[PDB]
Design a protein around this nucleic acid. Structure first.
Ligand SMILES: Nc1nc2c(ncn2[C@H]2C[C@H](O)[C@@H](COP(=O)(O)OP(=O)(O)[C@H](F)P(=O)(O)O)O2)c(=O)[nH]1
Ligand SMILES: [Cl-]
Ligand SMILES: [Cl-]
Ligand SMILES: [Cl-]
Ligand SMILES: [Mg+2]
Ligand SMILES: [Mg+2]
Ligand code: NA
Ligand code: NA
Ligand code: NA
Length: 326
DNA sequence: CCGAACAAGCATCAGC
DNA sequence: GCTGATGCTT
DNA sequence: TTCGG
């Protein structure tokens, strides 16, 4: 956190542009600059020094100069005073409330936690569960708790069918000492890119985790992606653990490496890697890497036998998960 | 100067 | 119902 | 907002 004041400022600007201005490219620009500055191994002395990094341009350099000189940014001082911006930023902290619904709620006079709680009938299902667990979802998960959760998920999945493989990805797989949620990649040999030989593969796992009261709520659920809520069991007289967000993603078994690369992230790492792929003439998603043809149409999937094969195609040296926390 | 900026699953809605 | 756009999310 | 052609 050599430059934590700068990166906090840029993150706050990113969130303003996403939530309030609905300016996605400014949001991405600020997050990318925060990320590249976060990895920079010197304490930054000037905007000009920062502008040498890719993703930091003229406007962010000027803001860095203001922040170094004064410890603050007038632009943010003013945003913090703006009631509509304050209301919108608060509302978007509820899972399922994005920039559009937040602004609509404000128009309707719904702008505080109390307002939301008395207007549950104006929320869709996702938003209602997001409100229910508003406090819990902003708490971090100690890696010690992530390990207990991993043990439950892996053992319960095994009881449904010993041929499932569940892999915990996200920041956990990158070795983080705490995580914001739990991300689980799931495979089963019945589900490949060529055929689905058994129905309900994801449903059966969700069902088992609900049966043992690990999964407590559902935000969304389809054939390949579950987004929901879980909770560790507590012992006698113990206060309960916070409820936690859990995402489960069933991926074709032959596409595990693209899937685990995607689900390990970070999100900015993936954006950077995919952007580099495009510059190299490839496109990467969670299933495949394919060349781009003469006109920019993706060709056929390329053979992939390891995470490293994907890095090789785009002429990147391999990066272990712990070095992808961008 | 100016076009591109990662890629996609699920929920929800409008239009036919 | 189906299709496609949009919102929200990973 | 930044980058690259
Ligand atoms: N290509 C692409 N991939 C994305 C995106 N968002 C998330 N992902 C992928 C990478 C995450 O690690 C992974 C899990 O998504 P996540 O939001 O749980 O992130 P994470 O890396 O686990 C955070 F550090 P934590 O949850 O601990 O707070 O999903 C995205 O916008 N684009
Ligand atoms: Cl924008
Ligand atoms: Cl500030
Ligand atoms: Cl594909
Ligand atoms: Mg996560
Ligand atoms: Mg570019
Ligand atoms: Na730069
Ligand atoms: Na939100
Ligand atoms: Na997640």
């Amino acid at each position: 956190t050599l430059n934590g004041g700068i990166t906090d400022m840029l993150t706050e600007l990113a969130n303003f542009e996403k939530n309030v201005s609905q300016a996605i490219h400014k949001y991405n620009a600020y997050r990318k600059a925060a990320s590249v500055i976060a990895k920079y191994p010197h304490k930054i002395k000037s905007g000009a020094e920062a502008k040498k990094l890719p993703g930091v341009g003229t406007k962010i350099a000027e803001k860095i100069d203001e922040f170094l000189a004064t410890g603050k940014l007038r632009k943010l001082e003013k945003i913090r005073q703006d009631d509509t911006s304050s209301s919108i930023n608060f509302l978007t902290r509820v899972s399922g409330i994005g920039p559009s619904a937040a602004r609509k709620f404000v128009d309707e006079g719904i702008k505080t936690l109390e307002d939301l709680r008395k207007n549950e009938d104006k929320l869709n299902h996702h938003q209602r569960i997001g409100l229910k667990y508003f406090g819990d979802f902003e708490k971090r998960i100690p890696r010690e708790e992530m390990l207990q959760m991993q043990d439950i998920v892996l053992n319960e999945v095994k009881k449904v069918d010993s041929e499932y493989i569940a892999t915990v990805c996200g920041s956990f797989r990158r070795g983080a000492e705490s995580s914001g949620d739990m991300d689980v990649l799931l495979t089963h040999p019945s589900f490949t890119s060529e055929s689905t030989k058994q129905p309900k593969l994801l449903h059966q796992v969700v069902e088992q985790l609900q049966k043992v009261h690990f999964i407590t709520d559902t935000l969304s659920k389809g054939e390949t992606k579950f987004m929901g809520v879980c909770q560790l069991p507590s012992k006698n007289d113990e206060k309960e653990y916070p409820h936690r967000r859990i995402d489960i993603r069933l991926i074709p078994k032959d596409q595990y490496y693209c899937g685990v690369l995607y689900f390990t992230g970070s999100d900015i790492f993936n954006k950077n890697m995919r952007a580099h792929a495009l510059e190299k003439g490839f496109t990467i998603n969670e299933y495949t890497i394919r060349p781009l043809g003469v006109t920019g149409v993706a060709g056929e999937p390329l053979p992939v036998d390891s995470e490293k094969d994907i890095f090789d195609y785009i002429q990147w040296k391999y990066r272990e998960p712990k070095d992808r926390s961008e």
